[PDB]
Scaffold this active site. Structure first.
Site, PDB file in Angstrom:
ATOM      1  N   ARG A  37       6.114  39.238 -13.606  1.00  0.00           N
ATOM      2  CA  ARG A  37       4.888  38.793 -14.256  1.00  0.00           C
ATOM      3  C   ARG A  37       3.830  39.873 -14.076  1.00  0.00           C
ATOM      4  O   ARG A  37       3.530  40.270 -12.944  1.00  0.00           O
ATOM      5  CB  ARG A  37       4.409  37.464 -13.673  1.00  0.00           C
ATOM      6  N   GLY A  38       3.271  40.346 -15.186  1.00  0.00           N
ATOM      7  CA  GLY A  38       2.284  41.403 -15.158  1.00  0.00           C
ATOM      8  C   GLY A  38       0.895  40.887 -14.841  1.00  0.00           C
ATOM      9  O   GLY A  38       0.709  39.775 -14.340  1.00  0.00           O
ATOM     10  N   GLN A  39      -0.102  41.722 -15.147  1.00  0.00           N
ATOM     11  CA  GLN A  39      -1.488  41.347 -14.889  1.00  0.00           C
ATOM     12  C   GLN A  39      -1.857  40.091 -15.671  1.00  0.00           C
ATOM     13  O   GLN A  39      -2.234  39.066 -15.092  1.00  0.00           O
ATOM     14  CB  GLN A  39      -2.435  42.499 -15.251  1.00  0.00           C
ATOM     15  N   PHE A  40      -1.752  40.160 -16.999  1.00  0.00           N
ATOM     16  CA  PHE A  40      -1.997  39.024 -17.878  1.00  0.00           C
ATOM     17  C   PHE A  40      -0.798  38.780 -18.787  1.00  0.00           C
ATOM     18  O   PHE A  40      -0.943  38.234 -19.884  1.00  0.00           O
ATOM     19  CB  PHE A  40      -3.258  39.242 -18.715  1.00  0.00           C
ATOM     20  N   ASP A  93      -4.867  53.011 -16.699  1.00  0.00           N
ATOM     21  CA  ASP A  93      -4.156  52.045 -15.869  1.00  0.00           C
ATOM     22  C   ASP A  93      -2.979  52.706 -15.161  1.00  0.00           C
ATOM     23  O   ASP A  93      -1.830  52.569 -15.593  1.00  0.00           O
ATOM     24  CB  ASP A  93      -3.671  50.863 -16.711  1.00  0.00           C
ATOM     25  N   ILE A 118      12.017  39.428 -15.387  1.00  0.00           N
ATOM     26  CA  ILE A 118      12.024  40.444 -14.341  1.00  0.00           C
ATOM     27  C   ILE A 118      10.726  40.454 -13.536  1.00  0.00           C
ATOM     28  O   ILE A 118      10.740  40.813 -12.354  1.00  0.00           O
ATOM     29  CB  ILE A 118      12.304  41.844 -14.926  1.00  0.00           C
ATOM     30  N   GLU A 171       3.849  38.374 -19.044  1.00  0.00           N
ATOM     31  CA  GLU A 171       5.156  38.137 -18.445  1.00  0.00           C
ATOM     32  C   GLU A 171       6.187  38.980 -19.182  1.00  0.00           C
ATOM     33  O   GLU A 171       6.278  38.916 -20.412  1.00  0.00           O
ATOM     34  CB  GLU A 171       5.533  36.654 -18.508  1.00  0.00           C
ATOM     35  N   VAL A 172       6.957  39.766 -18.434  1.00  0.00           N
ATOM     36  CA  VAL A 172       7.927  40.697 -19.001  1.00  0.00           C
ATOM     37  C   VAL A 172       9.328  40.174 -18.714  1.00  0.00           C
ATOM     38  O   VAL A 172       9.636  39.803 -17.575  1.00  0.00           O
ATOM     39  CB  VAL A 172       7.744  42.115 -18.433  1.00  0.00           C
TER      40      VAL A 172
END
Ligand SMILES: CN(C)CCCNS(=O)(=O)c1cccc(Nc2nc(OCC3CCCCC3)c3[nH]cnc3n2)c1
Length: 269
Positions: A22-25, A141, A20, A27-28
């Site tokens: 890619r996050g900061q560091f 955050d 769905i 991948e979701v």
């Protein structure tokens, strides 16, 4: 193959449907739990490499904390485990994607978010922050990329920070601009910038030049393009000026912000 004994503790009990985002560091991925059918969302933190033993311990300490928070406006937490040298964090799946996806959608069609819906959402995520701050927990955050929406319309806060080749946390703050440290009043700052991006579909200190010193100078003096006066109430515009205040002492407590949203949410019914 399959292992019900562990439950949500092994990646063998999920089927990864699609990636769905890619996050900061991280991948979701979207997934389905085979044991009971519930849809869950995995988070691959990639702590296996490029991380020391203490930083890993620190990463866990945050997870142990995030698991303790139970609130309607905070994303549910199901399981956290290390499998095959990869920290997977499976969290509740929200149909309507991250808030940034909604902003990038609205901006794509050149239509602003109505003030009546800004308060509708903003009050929800304020409730979550009052819950945390009342329990002596700062989110560390708060950004659109970490605010999620369900098909019903409810808004949820998300995971803690992963900060533990120059990088910008989406809403950089003055306390951190100098070597001062993150504090409670610094979460309001992020909250203030969030309310501004809902209204303007762009960060307040987003600039044409990405120079760190140039942006840093624009944060010292709170100079940013004001919001459309006609479409957004002075109540809102002043709440942004209030939270985006360089000196942390002048900002308000999360409660006062929470109370304003409640009152304003009722006004704009
Ligand atoms: C796009 N479609 C074609 C394919 C999927 C069909 N839609 S979908 O399945 O309901 C869908 C699509 C997108 C988002 C979401 N909601 C969601 N996304 C997460 O990922 C976070 C990640 C890290 C930060 C920024 C990038 C995304 C979550 N993390 C925790 N809870 C989350 N909830 C749901």
């Amino acid at each position: 193959a399959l292992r019900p004994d562990m439950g949500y503790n092994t990646l063998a009990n999920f089927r990864i449907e699609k990636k769905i985002g890619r996050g900061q560091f991280s991948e979701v991925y979207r997934a389905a739990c085979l044991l009971d059918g519930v849809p869950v969302a995995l988070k691959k933190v990639q702590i296996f490499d490029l991380m020391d033993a203490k930083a890993r311990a620190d990463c866990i300490k945050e997870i142990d904390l995030h698991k303790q928070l139970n609130h309607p406006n905070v994303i549910k937490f199901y399981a956290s485990f290390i499998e095959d040298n990869e920290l997977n964090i499976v969290l509740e799946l929200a149909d309507a994607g991250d808030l940034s996806r909604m902003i990038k959608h609205f901006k794509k069609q050149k239509r602003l978010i109505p003030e009546r819906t800004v308060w509708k959402y903003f009050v929800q995520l304020c409730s979550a922050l009052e819950h945390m701050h009342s329990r002596r927990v700062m989110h560390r955050d708060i950004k659109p990329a970490n605010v999620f929406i369900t098909a019903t319309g409810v808004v949820k806060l998300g995971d803690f920070g992963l900060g533990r080749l120059v990088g910008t946390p989406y809403y950089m703050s003055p306390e951190r601009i100098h070597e001062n440290g993150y504090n409670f009043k610094s979460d309001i700052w992020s909250l203030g910038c969030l309310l501004y991006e809902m209204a303007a579909l762009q960060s307040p200190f987003y600039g044409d030049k990405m120079n760190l010193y140039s942006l840093c100078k624009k944060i010292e003096q709170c100079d940013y393009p004001p919001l459309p006066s006609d479409h957004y109430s002075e109540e809102l515009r002043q709440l942004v000026n209030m939270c985006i205040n360089p000196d942390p002492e002048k900002r308000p407590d999360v409660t006062y912000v929470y109370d304003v949203a409640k009152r304003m949410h009722a006004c704009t019914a």
